[PDB]
């Protein structure tokens, strides 16, 4: 996008010898390779953004965090800064990771970002000062770890809840202010555009909604008309797979119309659509077809009345895409 | 001119960090010491990423990294 102004493509070095098992933090091969290639250079920052999988147990998470600490000890010189991400859980045996980080570092800070999800317990740890002197196998360390005192745990819970609440309030205020403003994006969006990133609204529409353009209201209208005619024709023509596919196609067409008309006119056709999307599902009813002018015909409405309303529930991976599309429509279209 | 504009925004955004400045309630220290996962309102601000949209969090951590990270050394990224 920038045209290699800063030569960023010439300053990324990949640590990989061809063996897949040398890329995973838990394995010893990864540590051996990293130490082999980075023992003779100076590393000031170690940034570890975990995959954050939910399948892994607490023991594996502790092992991976300890391995990251070992790597930082091995290759990091003095005044090295370690940045890591943690996902605390409701299960009470969760503060052992905090105890470990306190044990191996002297200046540990914990941050809850306002740009992160305010409905999830995602925190960032920053560590600066090395404290320990002896590094030993993982088993004895993981057996050594314990919980923390209850008073500090309750203080941490209260602080986490307060920070999450204030972050959510800031998020709501920022969304409202962005939707109100005429034609100027927020300063962080301007910075991201300057740095070389691209707006993803068109891409998300293209490989999500299969709509090449959202600005062209007309072609989207005729697309929905043919889609509804064909889906009703097939529905009376009668399976489970066909019903699911046809319902999904109709949902995508309806979402395309909603996003396009929000971008062009400034208001969603259905007021409850945004709240339902926040819940994670979308519904199209007889009333929605009856609402707007000349989208369909009376026979189409009567045919739809034999089914009433359809309600499709998405996976979180698609709920995120819906959220991004709605945000782009609200923050890039007219007020 | 693109590099100049990048440096210009870098220079101007020091008093305010693109409106993402941290408050006192966000930073805590261990020594000086319920949300539900079904909501994704935060993703309505993730509008500048095709493969990964998590380039907005780095812009916020950039303040602390400016403060505490040496700028004359190399960097390692894991995961």
Judged by CB atoms closer than 8 Å, whether chains meet at A324 and B74 is answered as: no
- Going A107 to A113 to A117 to A120, the CA torsion angle's sign is positive
d(CA A257, CA A221): 7
* Angle of CA points A13, A19, A20, to nearest 5°: 90
Among A106, A84, A97, A68, smallest CA distance to A156 is for: A97
Q: Is A287 exposed, middle or buried (0-12, 13-18, 19+ CB in 10 A)?
A: exposed
d(CA A279, CA A282): 9
Cα atoms in the Cβ-side hemisphere of radius 13 Å centred on B45: 28
- The CA distances from residue A191 to A196, A216, B12, B16, B59, in Å, are 9, 29, 11, 12, 9
DSSP string, A33-74: HHHHHHTTS-EEEEEE-----SSS-HHHHHHHHHHHHHHHHH
Closest chain A residue to the Cα of B19, Cα to Cα: A187
Question: Strand, coil or helix: what is A228?
Answer: helix
d(CA B35, CA A165): 9
Judged by CB atoms closer than 8 Å, whether chains meet at A278 and B50 is answered as: no
Among A260, A178, A32, A25, smallest CA distance to B44 is for: A178
d(CA A222, CA A213): 13
For A49, phi then psi, to 5°, come to -100, 100
For A54, phi then psi, to 5°, come to -90, -15
What Å resolution does this PDB entry report? 2.7
Gaps in chain B with C–N over 2.5 Å, residue before each: 33
d(CA B70, CA B67): 9
In chain B, residues with a C-beta closer than 8 Å to the C-beta of A3 are 2
**Residues 1-20 in A contacting B (C-alpha not used; CB under 8 Å):** 2-3, 5-6
Q: Which of A110, A113, A117 sits opposite B60 (nearest CB)?
A: A113
Q: Which residue has the tokens 């024709």?
A: A233
Among A224, A209, A333, A330, smallest CA distance to A278 is for: A330
Question: Strand, coil or helix: what is A140?
Answer: helix
Judged by CB atoms closer than 8 Å, whether chains meet at B47 and A190 is answered as: no
- How far out from the chain centre does Cα A147 lie? 30
Among B66, B64, B68, B69, smallest CA distance to B27 is for: B64
**Cβ(A43)–Cβ(A76) below 8 Å:** yes
Nearest CA to CA, how far is B17 from chain A (Å)?
Answer: 8
**Cβ(A226)–Cβ(A297) below 8 Å:** no
**Cβ(A120)–Cβ(A90) below 8 Å:** no
In chain B, residues with a C-beta closer than 8 Å to the C-beta of A172 are 41
Method: cryo-EM
**Cβ(A115)–Cβ(A141) below 8 Å:** no
Tokens found for residue A162: 């307060």
Nearest CA to CA, how far is B12 from chain A (Å)?
Answer: 11
């Amino acid at each position: 996008k920038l045209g290699n102004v800063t030569q960023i493509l010439n300053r990324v070095k990949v640590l990989f010898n061809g063996n897949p098992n040398s890329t995973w933090i838990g394995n010893m091969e990864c540590e051996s390779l990293i130490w082999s290639e980075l023992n003779d250079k100076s590393i000031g920052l170690v940034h570890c953004d975990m995959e954050g999988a939910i399948g892994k147990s607490e023991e594996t998470v502790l092992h991976e965090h300890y391995s990251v600490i070992r790597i930082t000890y091995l290759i990091g010189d003095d005044d090295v800064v370690l940045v890591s991400k943690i996902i605390p859980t409701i299960t009470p045996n969760w503060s052992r990771i905090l105890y470990l980080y306190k044990l191996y570092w002297k200046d540990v800070s914990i941050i809850s970002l306002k740009t992160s999800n305010p409905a999830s317990t995602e925190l960032y740890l920053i560590s600066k000062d090395a404290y320990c002197t002896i590094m030993e196998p993982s088993e004895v360390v993981l057996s050594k770890l314990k919980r923390l005192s209850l008073l500090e745990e309750n203080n941490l819970l209260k602080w986490i809840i307060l920070s999450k609440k204030r972050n959510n309030e800031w998020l709501h205020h920022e969304i409202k202010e962005g939707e109100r403003d005429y034609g100027v994006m927020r300063p962080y969006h301007m910075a991201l555009q300057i740095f070389g990133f691209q707006i993803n609204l068109n891409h998300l529409a293209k490989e999500f909604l299969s709509t090449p353009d959202l600005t062209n209201i007309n072609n989207i209208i005729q697309s929905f008309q043919r889609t509804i005619k064909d889906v009703l024709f097939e529905w009376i023509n009668i399976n489970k797979g066909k019903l699911r596919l046809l319902s999904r196609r109709l949902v995508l067409s309806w979402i395309s119309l909603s996003l396009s008309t929000r971008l062009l006119t400034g208001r969603f056709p259905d007021e409850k659509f945004e709240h339902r999307a926040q819940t994670g599902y979308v519904s199209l009813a007889d009333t929605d077809l009856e609402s707007l002018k000349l989208l369909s015909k009376n026979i189409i409405k009567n045919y739809r009345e034999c089914i009433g309303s359809i309600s499709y529930w998405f996976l979180t991976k698609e709920v995120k895409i819906l959220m991004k599309l709605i945000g782009g429509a609200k923050l890039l279209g007219i007020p | 001119i693109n590099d100049n504009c990048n440096k210009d925004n870098k220079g101007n955004k020091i008093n305010n960090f693109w409106g993402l400045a941290l408050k006192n309630y966000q930073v805590l220290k261990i020594r000086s010491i319920l949300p539900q996962g079904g909501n994704y309102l935060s993703h309505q601000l993730r509008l500048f990423g095709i493969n990964s949209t998590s380039c907005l969090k780095a812009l916020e951590l950039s303040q602390i990294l400016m403060k505490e990270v040496n700028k004359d050394k190399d960097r390692l990224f894991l995961g």
